Amino acid sequence: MDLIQAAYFVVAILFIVGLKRMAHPTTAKSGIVWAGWGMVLAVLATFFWPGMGNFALILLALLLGSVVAWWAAVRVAMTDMPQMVAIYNGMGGGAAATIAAVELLKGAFENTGLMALAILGGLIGSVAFTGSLIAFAKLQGIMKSRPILFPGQKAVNALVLALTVVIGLSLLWNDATASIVLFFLLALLFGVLMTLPIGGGDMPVAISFYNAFTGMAVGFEGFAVGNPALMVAGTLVGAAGTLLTVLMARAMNRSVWISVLVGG
């Protein structure tokens, strides 16, 4: 499968050039177009993976998700774009988790540092998923915009975090499919818990953060399974995303620690 390899390498170049161009006034518009092909190529080429099956379920799933998202993106008001970026970034996190989760149910690795990596991805992505949905909720006024506070939450969040990581690790020695679900629920829960304290007006920064989050999540998921397309792109974005988060914070004349709480 040097062919799939060839295609994923070109895909990698297409993303890099594309990301590079999105970053400059005169090249910005074409950037997304380049990245565009990168995806086409990537998706096409991945039909040729050895031992591939369940095609109908694949097409159906591709069609549904791409169509419903495109439809939504094309219809919303411009002033609702921050939340849209949020929901679509959520779903990426989810994606990374769904990957993580299925390889786990298949106990598909005898290499344990790889198991580790998948799990780490699964945590981060789950979190970016629910954290992005809450962000969404606030911008949409489905949920209170203001920081949502409670008696001693700082600890609950830490505690939930630690529990999750711990049951996360636990999978290396023992991964009763029971403990798997627990891990995701804790991850998911923590995403929610994390974002409650974030003020509506701070949200574009948190959205960047979660973008970085899902980026990293997919890169990790990529290394863990042997996928270069994901390896490169995840981290590329994870990296560029985290820097972007910093400059956004700076532009708002705010710190990201400031945003990540504003009251415990």
Binding site: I32, S66, M78, G238, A239
Partner: protein, 94 residues
């Protein structure tokens, strides 16, 4: 970090620096589009959800794989769509 460990590790870090480097010097006016398009880019997750769906046996595997791929494709489709819409704010009306 795999295929094989050392090579992969260089790949992580080389990309980490590059990810970073490309984004320094972005003007402020380009923050959110950049954010949108990098959001699009990480949509490649589908490709891994794809592989997962297409190698699923037990059927609990079916469903979640299926989700994975729906989620994946939304990420891409939406991301692309959104970024294009953002970019048009920069164009004069003819």
């Amino acid at each position: 970090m795999e295929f094989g460990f050392w090579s992969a590790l260089y790949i992580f870090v080389l990309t980490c620096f590059l990810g970073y480097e490309l984004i320094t010097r972005v003007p402020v006016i380009l923050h959110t589009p950049l954010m949108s398009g990098s959001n699009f880019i990480h949509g490649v997750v589908v490709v891994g959800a794809m592989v997962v769906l297409g190698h699923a046996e037990t059927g609990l595997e079916k469903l979640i794989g299926f989700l994975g791929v729906i989620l994946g494709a939304a990420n891409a489709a939406g991301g692309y769509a959104v970024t294009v819409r953002m970019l048009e704010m920069f164009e004069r009306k003819p």
